[PDB]
Design an enzyme around this catalytic site. Structure first.
Site, PDB file in Angstrom:
ATOM      1  N   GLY A   1       0.790  -1.224   0.000  1.00  0.00           N
ATOM      2  CA  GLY A   1       0.000   0.000   0.000  1.00  0.00           C
ATOM      3  C   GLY A   1       0.822   1.274   0.000  1.00  0.00           C
TER       4      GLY A   1
ATOM      5  CG  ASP B   1      13.689  -5.333   7.021  1.00  0.00           C
ATOM      6  OD1 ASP B   1      14.922  -5.340   6.770  1.00  0.00           O
ATOM      7  OD2 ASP B   1      12.827  -4.927   6.208  1.00  0.00           O
TER       8      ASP B   1
END
Ligand SMILES: Cc1nc(Nc2ncc(C(=O)Nc3cccc(NC(=O)c4cccc(C(F)(F)F)c4)c3)s2)cc(N2CCN(CCO)CC2)n1
Ligand SMILES: Cc1nc(Nc2ncc(C(=O)Nc3cccc(NC(=O)c4cccc(C(F)(F)F)c4)c3)s2)cc(N2CCN(CCO)CC2)n1
Lengths: 255, 253
Positions: free
Chosen positions: A19, A126
């Site tokens: 998105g 991450d």
């Protein structure tokens, strides 16, 4: 429980694409950040799985969840970070003026947020400057926008993602802070990195960076994950750095 | 008198840097392991002259000296390094209150000799304490640490053995916090103002109240109200029998 209607939200300025992430106003007063989901790319049940993680995590050095929208298009509302990603911040206008006392304080803040994640038995997977958000008064908060050069070998090769693989990633993040957002292992491709780190290659001491901070990076990059330091140790070491580790530190041209 | 030729000592591994010179690990006459230290030449050699008068088991013992420039002050070698690095490092997680109190007892013993000899250290802290084998702690001097300095010594230059007692109290927080910088979150400026209005560091986590009371005795506003290192040595040696006989080891202390 965290649900709110779309009427209270007003998306004003787009910040990122993928998105997408927006800057808005919740209930016409509180300035917020809205992460939207592009339908088709990912199912709403899989997209809200990230918010489920944010519901259980609450700390001053993590991006705080405010509200969620279960009606499509799905919105995940959080606090607003005024200066953006640490990577863009280090690369931008601010990079030239940032010195080691500022960068170590930023590192100490990230280490604090990751020390909470450590206590909660969560794994980021991450951790990098791109997933660190900067606000006012150099406030750094751990985030996740959704990276072989940052991933620990056992995590990249055998999928062993632990808090010790996050420690490795924090070591790489230190090079990003000390090189002003420069990509780790310069000139080396993802294949070259994975094969060289196995043979024992580690990034050399960045220019103007004290050897003591490179030793901490090298502690984060130990082959055995169990030998790697805790984020509690990293936080304490970075907070006390200019008294206990480098008391005779002199500012240079870049660091 | 303590002089030896330059061909005798060999500097092998660099241990420290900065200040006026550098600390190096080496070999003297190719048999015994030593530590060599590489400001005017009369000012640097003056440090070695002080070491000639001070002789104690809990003080870094002077072995040899080189009078002509470059000057080489030779001492004994401490295999584990500084107490600060020792506490901050891999050994910190294993050290509990019986070990840390024993280390403090050894520093108090060294400082008790300093007291008897009418000498003032001026910079007592974990960074100036060296650790050897079997947790042997010896008082050293590597050459502002406002957080460790007494208010009368910092503001009015009134450096005494009683201001060294204050510094020992701060060293006790370093031991009990595993090398953490005292007054966390406070800068040297807000330290002097808070300490003057009567602020004192609280009891560290898992530290017994009795050891914090001793820290506060070292931190009394009036320097003559501070205890002697002779009292400090005796208190720490007898701690687990006289003060804390029902002590139980915890997660950190
Ligand atoms: C991309 C960007 N984001 C900005 N600020 C942001 N504040 C918050 C943002 C954000 O990503 N919010 C958000 C929304 C939805 C979900 C999440 N979740 C997470 O990030 C997340 C997910 C899982 C775990 C964790 C944690 F904490 F454990 F580590 C965190 C975060 S993004 C500012 C900015 N700037 C550039 C433009 N300039 C000028 C004005 O245009 C302002 C700074 N650029
Ligand atoms: C910085 C350091 N010093 C180490 N050992 C040392 N042993 C002795 C040292 C030293 O400072 N020696 C020395 C040389 C010349 C002069 C002096 N003098 C003094 O320190 C001195 C001066 C005035 C007064 C006093 C006193 F006692 F009243 F307080 C003391 C001392 S330094 C080991 C070490 N490490 C341990 C292991 N190694 C690696 C091993 O391969 C890494 C770190 N790191």
């Amino acid at each position: 429980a965290w649900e709110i209607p779309r009427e209270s939200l007003r998306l004003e300025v787009k910040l990122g694409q993928g998105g997408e992430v927006w800057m808005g106003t919740w209930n016409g007063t509180t300035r917020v950040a809205i992460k939207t989901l592009k339908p088709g790319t990912m199912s709403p049940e899989a997209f809200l799985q990230e918010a489920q993680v944010m519901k259980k995590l609450r700390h001053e050095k993590l991006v705080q969840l405010y509200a969620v929208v279960s009606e499509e298009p799905i919105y995940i509302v959080t606090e607003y970070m005024s200066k953006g990603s640490l990577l863009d911040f280090l690369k931008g206008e601010m990079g030239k003026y940032l010195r080691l006392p500022q960068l170590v304080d930023m590192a100490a803040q990230i280490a604090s947020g990751m020390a909470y994640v450590e206590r909660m038995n969560y794994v980021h997977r991450d951790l990098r400057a791109a997933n660190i958000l900067v606000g006012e008064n150099l406030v750094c908060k751990v985030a996740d926008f959704g990276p072989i050069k940052w991933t620990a070998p056992e995590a990249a090769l055998y999928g062993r993602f632990t808090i010790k693989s996050d420690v490795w990633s924090f070591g790489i993040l230190l090079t990003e802070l000390t090189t002003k957002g420069r990509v780790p292992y310069p000139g080396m491709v993802n294949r070259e990195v994975l094969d060289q780190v196995e043979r024992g290659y580690r990034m050399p001491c960045p220019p103007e960076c004290p050897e003591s901070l490179h030793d901490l990076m090298c502690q984060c990059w130990r082959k055995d994950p169990e030998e790697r330091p805790t984020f509690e140790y990293l936080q304490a070491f970075l907070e006390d750095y200019f008294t206990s580790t480098e008391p005779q530190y002199q500012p240079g041209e870049n660091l």
